[PDB]
Amino acid sequence: PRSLKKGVFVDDHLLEKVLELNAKGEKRLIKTWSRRSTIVPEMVGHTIAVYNGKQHVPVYITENMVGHKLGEFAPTRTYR
Amino acid sequence: ARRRRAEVRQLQPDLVYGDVLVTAFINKIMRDGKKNLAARIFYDACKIIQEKTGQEPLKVFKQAVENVKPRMEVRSRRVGGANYQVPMEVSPRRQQSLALRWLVQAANQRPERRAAVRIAHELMDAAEGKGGAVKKKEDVERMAEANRAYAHYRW
């Protein structure tokens, strides 16, 4: 039951940096500390590497995981 | 109470029978100061004592209290090592406090889903000489008079 309102937020570090790669097709990697950003279609297919707060983990962004927020795919804590 | 001999709070008589003893019983039914619901329950009950019993409720009530007042009770006490349970009389004051308390307690120990009824039926049973209320009362006296050996520790 999540909620932002009107204006799906996405930091434009990777945004305007991800679509620039949409011009030449895609690319081979990215890496942003903006785990705060929502995922938009243009991200699909791509492979953004998010920050644990220690590491840059490679996250393949597929359709099924659009609406989510990157960080939700880069675990923070280490347990068991 | 180290100093004075704490006098008893005098209660304003009943708003129907003008009987203080009744207010007392109603206060023992009350909980969270919801004195209305408390007064109601006791009156609804009095009208349940009128139906199922051709007698005046007020007299059934007083009769009850009477059979439920213990006249002897056991009070613990340390006497050379062990704690011998010394048997002794019960003040007129304490008799009431216990009688009323016991009634409400046993009453709320009954099954009938309705509060007002448990009180109604408990009171009656008490009058007849039966019921959880009179049990405790007779249990107390039994307790004393069964320890009537250490009664020379009169207290």
Partner: protein, 62 residues
Amino acid sequence: KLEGELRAEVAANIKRLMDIGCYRGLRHRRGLPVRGQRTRTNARTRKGPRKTVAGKKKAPRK
């Protein structure tokens, strides 16, 4: 959308965020609370009965 067909959906949902690296899904696997609550104490409704273990006494764990 009621009964079976519904439980089918819900189950279907969970299965999804569970198939994708999604965290919320891992909380289901691991069997721990999902809606970000404390798991150091009070999580019995999600963990089950306490599973007591041996411990460290003198160290005022009061």
